Amino acid sequence: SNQAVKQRIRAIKNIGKITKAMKMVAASKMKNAQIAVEQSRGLVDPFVRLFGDFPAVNSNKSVVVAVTSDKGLCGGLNSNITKYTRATLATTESEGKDVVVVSIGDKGRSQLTRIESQRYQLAIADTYKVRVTFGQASLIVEELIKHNPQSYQILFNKFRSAISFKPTVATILSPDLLEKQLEDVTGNSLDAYDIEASHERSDVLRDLTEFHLGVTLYNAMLENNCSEHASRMSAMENSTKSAGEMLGKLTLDYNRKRQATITTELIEIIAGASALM
Amino acid sequence: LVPIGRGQRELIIGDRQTGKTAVAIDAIIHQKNCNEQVPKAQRVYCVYVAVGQKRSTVAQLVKLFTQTGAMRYTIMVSATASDAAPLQFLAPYSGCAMAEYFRDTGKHGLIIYDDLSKQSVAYRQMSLLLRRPPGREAFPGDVFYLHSRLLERAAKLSKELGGGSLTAFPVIETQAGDVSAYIATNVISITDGQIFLETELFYKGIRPALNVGLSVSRVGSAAQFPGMKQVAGTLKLELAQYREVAAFAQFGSDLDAATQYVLERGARLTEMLKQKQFAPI
Amino acid sequence: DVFYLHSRLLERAAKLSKELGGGSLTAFPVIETQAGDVSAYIATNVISITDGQIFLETELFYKGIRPALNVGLSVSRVGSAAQFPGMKQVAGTLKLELAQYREVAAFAQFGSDLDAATQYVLERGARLTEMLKQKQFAPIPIERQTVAVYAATKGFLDKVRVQDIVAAEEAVISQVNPAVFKILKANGKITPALDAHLKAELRKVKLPGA
Amino acid sequence: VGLSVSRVGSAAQFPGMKQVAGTLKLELAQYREVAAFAQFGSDLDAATQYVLERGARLTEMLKQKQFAPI
Amino acid sequence: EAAAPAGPKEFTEVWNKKAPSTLIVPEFPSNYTAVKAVGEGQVHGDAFPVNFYTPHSILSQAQKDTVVLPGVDGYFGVKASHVPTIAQLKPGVVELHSGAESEKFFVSGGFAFVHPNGVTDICVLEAATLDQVDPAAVKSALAAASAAQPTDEFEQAANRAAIELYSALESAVEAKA
Amino acid sequence: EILVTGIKVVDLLAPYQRGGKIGLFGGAGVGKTVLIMELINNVAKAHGGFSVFAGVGERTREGNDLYREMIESGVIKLGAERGNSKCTLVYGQMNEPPGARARVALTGLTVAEYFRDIEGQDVLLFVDNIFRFTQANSEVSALLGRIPSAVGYQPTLATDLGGLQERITTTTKGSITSVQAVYVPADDLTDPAPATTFAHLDATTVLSRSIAELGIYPAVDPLDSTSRMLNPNVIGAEHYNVARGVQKVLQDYKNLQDIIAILGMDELSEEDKLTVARARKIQRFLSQPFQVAEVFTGTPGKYVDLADTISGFQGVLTGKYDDLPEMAFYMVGDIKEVKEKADKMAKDIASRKEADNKKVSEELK
Amino acid sequence: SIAELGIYPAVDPLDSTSRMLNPNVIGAEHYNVARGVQKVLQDYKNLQDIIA
Amino acid sequence: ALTGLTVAEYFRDIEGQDVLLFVDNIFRFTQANSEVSALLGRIPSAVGYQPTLATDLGGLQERITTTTKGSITSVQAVYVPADDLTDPAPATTFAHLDATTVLSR
Amino acid sequence: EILVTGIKVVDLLAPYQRGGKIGLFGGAGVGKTVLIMELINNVAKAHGGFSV
Amino acid sequence: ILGMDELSEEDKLTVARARKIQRFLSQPFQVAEVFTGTPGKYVDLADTISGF
Numbered sequence A: 001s002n003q004a005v006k007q008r009i010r011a012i013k014n015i016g017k018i019t020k021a022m023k024m025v026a027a028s029k030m031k032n033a034q035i036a037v038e039q040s041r042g043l044v045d046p047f048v049r050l051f052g053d054f055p056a057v058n059s060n061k062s063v064v065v066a067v068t069s070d071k072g073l074c075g076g077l078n079s080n081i082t083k084y085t086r087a088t089l090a091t092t093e094s095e096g097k098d099v100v101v102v103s104i105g106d107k108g109r110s111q112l113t114r115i116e117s118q119r120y121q122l123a124i125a126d127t128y129k130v131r132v133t134f135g136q137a138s139l140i141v142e143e144l145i146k147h148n149p150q151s152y153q154i155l156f157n158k159f160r161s162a163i164s165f166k167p168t169v170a171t172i173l174s175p176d177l178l179e180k181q182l183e184d185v186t187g188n189s190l191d192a193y194d195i196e197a198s199h200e201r202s203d204v205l206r207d208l209t210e211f212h213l214g215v216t217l218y219n220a221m222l223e224n225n226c227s228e229h230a231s232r233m234s235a236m237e238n239s240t241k242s243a244g245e246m247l248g249k250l251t252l253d254y255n256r257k258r259q260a261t262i263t264t265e266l267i268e269i270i271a272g273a274s275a276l277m
Numbered sequence B: 001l002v003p004i005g006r007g008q009r010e011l012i013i014g015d016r017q018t019g020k021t022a023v024a025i026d027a028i029i030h031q032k033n034c035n036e037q038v039p040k041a042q043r044v045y046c047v048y049v050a051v052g053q054k055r056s057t058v059a060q061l062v063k064l065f066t067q068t069g070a071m072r073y074t075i076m077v078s079a080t081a082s083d084a085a086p087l088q089f090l091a092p093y094s095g096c097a098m099a100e101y102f103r104d105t106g107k108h109g110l111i112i113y114d115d116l117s118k119q120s121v122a123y124r125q126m127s128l129l130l131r132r133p134p135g136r137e138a139f140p141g142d143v144f145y146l147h148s149r150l151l152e153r154a155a156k157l158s159k160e161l162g163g164g165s166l167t168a169f170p171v172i173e174t175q176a177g178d179v180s181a182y183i184a185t186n187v188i189s190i191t192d193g194q195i196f197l198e199t200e201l202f203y204k205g206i207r208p209a210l211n212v213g214l215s216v217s218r219v220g221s222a223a224q225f226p227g228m229k230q231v232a233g234t235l236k237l238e239l240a241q242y243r244e245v246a247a248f249a250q251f252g253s254d255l256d257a258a259t260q261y262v263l264e265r266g267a268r269l270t271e272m273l274k275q276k277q278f279a280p281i
Numbered sequence C: 001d002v003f004y005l006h007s008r009l010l011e012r013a014a015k016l017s018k019e020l021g022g023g024s025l026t027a028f029p030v031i032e033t034q035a036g037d038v039s040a041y042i043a044t045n046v047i048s049i050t051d052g053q054i055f056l057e058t059e060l061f062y063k064g065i066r067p068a069l070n071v072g073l074s075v076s077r078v079g080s081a082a083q084f085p086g087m088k089q090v091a092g093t094l095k096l097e098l099a100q101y102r103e104v105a106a107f108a109q110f111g112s113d114l115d116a117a118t119q120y121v122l123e124r125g126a127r128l129t130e131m132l133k134q135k136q137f138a139p140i141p142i143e144r145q146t147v148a149v150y151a152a153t154k155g156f157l158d159k160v161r162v163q164d165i166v167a168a169e170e171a172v173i174s175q176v177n178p179a180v181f182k183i184l185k186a187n188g189k190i191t192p193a194l195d196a197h198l199k200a201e202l203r204k205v206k207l208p209g210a
Numbered sequence D: 001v002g003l004s005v006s007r008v009g010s011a012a013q014f015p016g017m018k019q020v021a022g023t024l025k026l027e028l029a030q031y032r033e034v035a036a037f038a039q040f041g042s043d044l045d046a047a048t049q050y051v052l053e054r055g056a057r058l059t060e061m062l063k064q065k066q067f068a069p070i
Numbered sequence E: 001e002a003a004a005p006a007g008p009k010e011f012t013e014v015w016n017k018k019a020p021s022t023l024i025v026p027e028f029p030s031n032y033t034a035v036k037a038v039g040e041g042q043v044h045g046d047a048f049p050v051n052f053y054t055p056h057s058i059l060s061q062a063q064k065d066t067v068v069l070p071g072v073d074g075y076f077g078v079k080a081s082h083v084p085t086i087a088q089l090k091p092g093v094v095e096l097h098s099g100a101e102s103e104k105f106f107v108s109g110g111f112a113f114v115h116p117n118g119v120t121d122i123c124v125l126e127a128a129t130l131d132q133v134d135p136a137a138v139k140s141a142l143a144a145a146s147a148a149q150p151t152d153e154f155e156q157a158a159n160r161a162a163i164e165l166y167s168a169l170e171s172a173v174e175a176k177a
Numbered sequence F: 001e002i003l004v005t006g007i008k009v010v011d012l013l014a015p016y017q018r019g020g021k022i023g024l025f026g027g028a029g030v031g032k033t034v035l036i037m038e039l040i041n042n043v044a045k046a047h048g049g050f051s052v053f054a055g056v057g058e059r060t061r062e063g064n065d066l067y068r069e070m071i072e073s074g075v076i077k078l079g080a081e082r083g084n085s086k087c088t089l090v091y092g093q094m095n096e097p098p099g100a101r102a103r104v105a106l107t108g109l110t111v112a113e114y115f116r117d118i119e120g121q122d123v124l125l126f127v128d129n130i131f132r133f134t135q136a137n138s139e140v141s142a143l144l145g146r147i148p149s150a151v152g153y154q155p156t157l158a159t160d161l162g163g164l165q166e167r168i169t170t171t172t173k174g175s176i177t178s179v180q181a182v183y184v185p186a187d188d189l190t191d192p193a194p195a196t197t198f199a200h201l202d203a204t205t206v207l208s209r210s211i212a213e214l215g216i217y218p219a220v221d222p223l224d225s226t227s228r229m230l231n232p233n234v235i236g237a238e239h240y241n242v243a244r245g246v247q248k249v250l251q252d253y254k255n256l257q258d259i260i261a262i263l264g265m266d267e268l269s270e271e272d273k274l275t276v277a278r279a280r281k282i283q284r285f286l287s288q289p290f291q292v293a294e295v296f297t298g299t300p301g302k303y304v305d306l307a308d309t310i311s312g313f314q315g316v317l318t319g320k321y322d323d324l325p326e327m328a329f330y331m332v333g334d335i336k337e338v339k340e341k342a343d344k345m346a347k348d349i350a351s352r353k354e355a356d357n358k359k360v361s362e363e364l365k
Numbered sequence G: 001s002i003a004e005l006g007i008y009p010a011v012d013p014l015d016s017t018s019r020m021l022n023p024n025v026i027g028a029e030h031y032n033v034a035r036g037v038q039k040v041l042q043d044y045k046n047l048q049d050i051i052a
Numbered sequence H: 001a002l003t004g005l006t007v008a009e010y011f012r013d014i015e016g017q018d019v020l021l022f023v024d025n026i027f028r029f030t031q032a033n034s035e036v037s038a039l040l041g042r043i044p045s046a047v048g049y050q051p052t053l054a055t056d057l058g059g060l061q062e063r064i065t066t067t068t069k070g071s072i073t074s075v076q077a078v079y080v081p082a083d084d085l086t087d088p089a090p091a092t093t094f095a096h097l098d099a100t101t102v103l104s105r
Numbered sequence I: 001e002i003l004v005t006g007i008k009v010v011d012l013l014a015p016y017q018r019g020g021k022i023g024l025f026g027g028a029g030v031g032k033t034v035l036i037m038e039l040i041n042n043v044a045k046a047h048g049g050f051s052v
Numbered sequence J: 001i002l003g004m005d006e007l008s009e010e011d012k013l014t015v016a017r018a019r020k021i022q023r024f025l026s027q028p029f030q031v032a033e034v035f036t037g038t039p040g041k042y043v044d045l046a047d048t049i050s051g052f
């Protein structure tokens, strides 16, 4: 029966080297996205210093977008924003608004279908296949724009460092229905900005909020990618420690089983010999 | 999946508490139902020998056999643990002699050696007390000849000698799924089949806990009911394709939506092979 | 007969009756362990004879926690509800805080999730672990021990991070009135007449940690 | 190569072979640590993959052909 | 009119009532920016700060004294205390000047903003520098653009954008210093 | 017939036969003797028949503690009232030489068999650590001119243990409910003395070390202890079906433990997180604070009725209490006290403070 | 373990050897494809700790 | 090694010096004593060793102490048989070792 | 008391108890014989004691 | 897995200190000067403690 614990040591040791390889993979790929996230952080400040930050608005129809990962080696990432989806979708509902939950990533449809399926319409997958590109963001934004909600909420994890992943709600409002309505403070705080558009303000704000949605969704599915590499890094160095301690315990049990088998089969020989002569 | 023909030594091996005795008793209980339907010539006369069992257990089984009516056809050779080790060494043999009368005179016999791993202990006691030198783990080397002299007596004779038969059912108790134990490794090579029962399947709902990857019968589909051969010929394949698709999906990694069906199809079959305590179908 | 060897050796450590002199005898058998296995032959023999255990873990000793008492596996159920009760007031709370620290240190083998109230447990346990450990050949009497565990199971020591408790224990031993030590020794327990003094003295402490 | 050692060492090695075998076993010792990473061939590090392909150069270099003494 | 008193600091207290208390409040993009709109000042002379942006890169964040935006009513220059502006830009060249040095960047179409604090936020998709563009295949690109004229309004819009973009590239490649 | 014991995991997963044998398999520090003292404190008072406690090679201090318990609890009455007593101790504890530990089980069995045969009443034979009888016989058998068998034991182990253990059974004239601790030697269930002892016990309750390492007391392994009364012909279908459900969930958790150890609960699917959450709740819920363990813990002991076991365990199997956390099921009596502890558990998470003033600790009172 | 994978006969493809596997005895085109099949099966065996 | 202890004891007690000793590979002294105690017909102990392992190793290691005359410091190379510190030869060795010095590659 | 052997690492980190026992976990080619010879030379040069 | 220039200033001073301590634990040995040329240096203990 001593052949089980040796092949189990063989299995756990190569699992340990697998995760010792994939911690290298994830911590490497966290850095090649780090030359792009702070660059993709460039267009997220002008819109919020222009439009403000107004999440808790009584929208009539709203598309909340919870962008998740592709491969399910996340480690406190996908289910985190899955619970954050209902936690930021429940404080916003007070009068029964239309809600269109959209999940980006293959690990979104596997988890968000359980809690909110009746308000679940779009599941965008294979988005981190090659890399993240802006025209992909424009296309998914247009596929949200086919419907005409009154607001948007974008649930994504802000990659600040390799330890802290605070999820964020990026807010995108409807241009004439709610965006210009929320700026009404003693007139309009937007009218001090002089328009330099072709047509009126009412259809340049449409272009502005479509660009805002596309930019912030691009930033969301880049920051979730970089925090996914960071969280797979933080999860593959716990599997390495786990397959280190499991290998240590199984090596101790292999040594104890080795000593027990050699002592028992030696006792067998001595009991066979002294009961003969 | 492991069909049992008349003249086959089929081993029922498990852990301490699996469905070992209860899957043997169902073979005796059902021989009340068949023998009230088959003619006189092809009647099966069961013999259940108890080696080293508790004496309250044997009084429960004769309570059970007289409760269902199986005692009309059953001899119950009890070598309880109160009996000395020269009795429990002998009682599988003497049970076979009481059963070989039915193989002598053209009828069909059935014998179930309960816990032959306690016959070897009662042979280990005398051989270590007659000063015979111990071999493996304490057993003398001829503990294979202990069982091979016994299990090879279960045979289906030829048609000039009466045409009788005698189906054995040796029962072996392992420790922790230790099929590499010395006593068990003798009997697995002797018997035609093997019905290996596992306890971690027994608590997962599979009752009888037949570890269906490890249960084979060398007599095979030549000796089964003809209606079940054409039908269940894909059954052992459909359980075979259940295990490796359940050996991959356990991580929570990925589904293929068609191998999800072949894992679902095996799940309608895994719950199909469960049976109750004393139920013959 | 190794079990009979250790049994007839250790079974003579008794607390005799009041008609047989009233004496006693306390054993301390020390069993060498190889790679920390409790499931040996000699270890599991002597555990089924002795009235308790004091498990000394190798990993806790390597990290500078000396003595390395594994408080999870170390049980002694004849001495609890037989000990000095002034210790036993705060010692049950100490047991709960050490058990909570064991549980949350197992739940956080690496620091990634912060709940800001479990961090109070992870601060208190690393404080108490630093309070309980000591230097070699240094006996501490029970009256200078009840005060040092009283001033740590409660507050009065969370002002240091974790570090200077090695100065803070000798600091609170020095800066209390040594009159209260005679009271806590002779009385046996923390009376409210001494509990209010113990709350009173513990806030004027010049603690070197800030 | 990771287990089979000569306790004499390179002191009685053929010179000229000693000029090259010390670098050979050094790259092979780096190879056996960077071994079991060839299955993640899509993920490079551009230097671990260089020593990985050089270990694949040298490990398939030392093959023999069944009573071919050189 | 504005009957929804939203906000990031108000969202904390309305998040504390329905969600369970064990979780930290999620963050907002207002916490990841410090250069605001109505924060008065931020001019300090002739150098006004310029936030030149791009989705995939950041090409300039240092301070300039003149930026010329190719607005749809024409190219117009941005000074220090410029007017608050929401300007949709034509596909053309932006002109980055810090003083005696002048660098010119061809932009592909995208908005540009000035806020009341004198800071600018130039927000364009593809900001191609004039050193990496060619003057050879632009005439072939216009010859492709001046050929395919079907009846679809979608193709008419994309083809007219092609003509205007390629003609702006020609005008911003032929007259170079 | 059923024997109601008032322990949760015992009455649910391996219920004791009133006319059978009861085994406790322990590995030096898992608490088989504390469990048998709680089994005494539950059963031997309500079960009005005579009881025989035969200590075979356990600690002498525990024998003296049992004597000082059974004197002041009215079980043994001394002086002029010796007739009212309900227990007879036979004590061959571990200081006695291995001749004397090899027969003191037989002495306690003869005292039980006189109450069975001649008196004709139902006897509770509480044999303490019957493995020490096999140990004393093995120590003798090295010198008796015999050959050593497997691991170190007697050649005549099986017939000796049978010749003891087939006396302790319930005849037509009397009944002996036998509760035996069986010390496993070195956490080694393949050892021939516990391997022989498994075949003689009607309702084996195996105590493990790993479950004790998680603090779950009593540390009964719920997946290896079983009975013959765990069958739907004697206990009704609801109890058997809830028992098979809780064993199914625990077996699935013990399957998932490997992937949980390597990867964590993050990698698992949501139905498997449901199974793991239910399994942790029913794994802590088998724990209870004992009435004999209150001398070293301060927690008051709780007797759990069989209907409350079936109510609470059926509820946590179906999902009536999925909202409650894990710690609400730790060291609790039954499902009323679970929600009572969930009230206490919630309450202290905020109210943790405010003791600075209005104390007696001013100087002048 | 090959028999449990259903391959009948359950011949272990790696550890089954022969002295008739020398290319100067049976010709080289047999030994080349045999060592190729052995190499491909050994790569699959080294990979099935990661495929698993 | 007892001859080595004798020449070291003459350099310690008579010459009054501070003597070094080098027991080369104490596991082979364990193996030689195991061979002479399996040779004479004594019943072998745990994993394969002599029954007199502890006392016939302590007969060697306990002449290696300080004395009021001089001292003997011995530097014994220790080899672990299966690289297992639960093995009884390093378990009975390491209860005498005072300072270990790991040499690395 | 301590034995000053002269090496910095075995006098600083893991000191040699004068009169005690020393364990070397050597190997091949790691300079164990050079370590032995230097220990002998240093102790015979300074402490006035021989070696065996 | 992160990079050489990644760590903070509180640690990389200790990285330099350990990388100059670990080479400082070496010593020229007098018995190896017959084929290394450099003569050995016997080090006292108090000098080792102070200079470390």
Ligand SMILES: Nc1ncnc2c1ncn2[C@@H]1O[C@H](COP(=O)(O)OP(=O)(O)OP(=O)(O)O)[C@@H](O)[C@H]1O
Residues within 6 Å of the ligand: B014, B015, B016, B017, B018, B019, B020, B021, B022, B023, B173, B207, B208, B275, B276, B277, F198, F199, F227, F228, F230, F231
């Ligand atoms: N088909 C079945 N369905 C449900 N329960 C079963 C079935 N077969 C057996 N059991 C239960 O499993 C338990 C063990 O069955 P069985 O009597 O075969 O054990 P065993 O291995 O024979 O034990 P031993 O070998 O010690 O006698 C019994 O309590 C029985 O009620």
Ligand SMILES: Nc1ncnc2c1ncn2[C@@H]1O[C@H](COP(=O)(O)OP(=O)(O)O)[C@@H](O)[C@H]1O
Residues within 6 Å of the ligand: C047, C048, C075, C076, C077, F026, F027, F028, F029, F030, F031, F032, F033, F034, F035, F217, F218, F288, F289, F290, F293, F297
């Ligand atoms: N219900 C319980 N509550 C708390 N502790 C327990 C309980 N049952 C057993 N224990 C612990 O198990 C330990 C060993 O118990 P005991 O039965 O005396 O050991 P053994 O099983 O070796 O006789 C005791 O120290 C006790 O603390």
Ligand SMILES: [Mg+2]
Residues within 6 Å of the ligand: B020, B021, B114, B115, B171
């Ligand atoms: Mg059976």
Ligand SMILES: [Mg+2]
Residues within 6 Å of the ligand: F032, F033, F034, F058, F059, F062
């Ligand atoms: Mg006990």
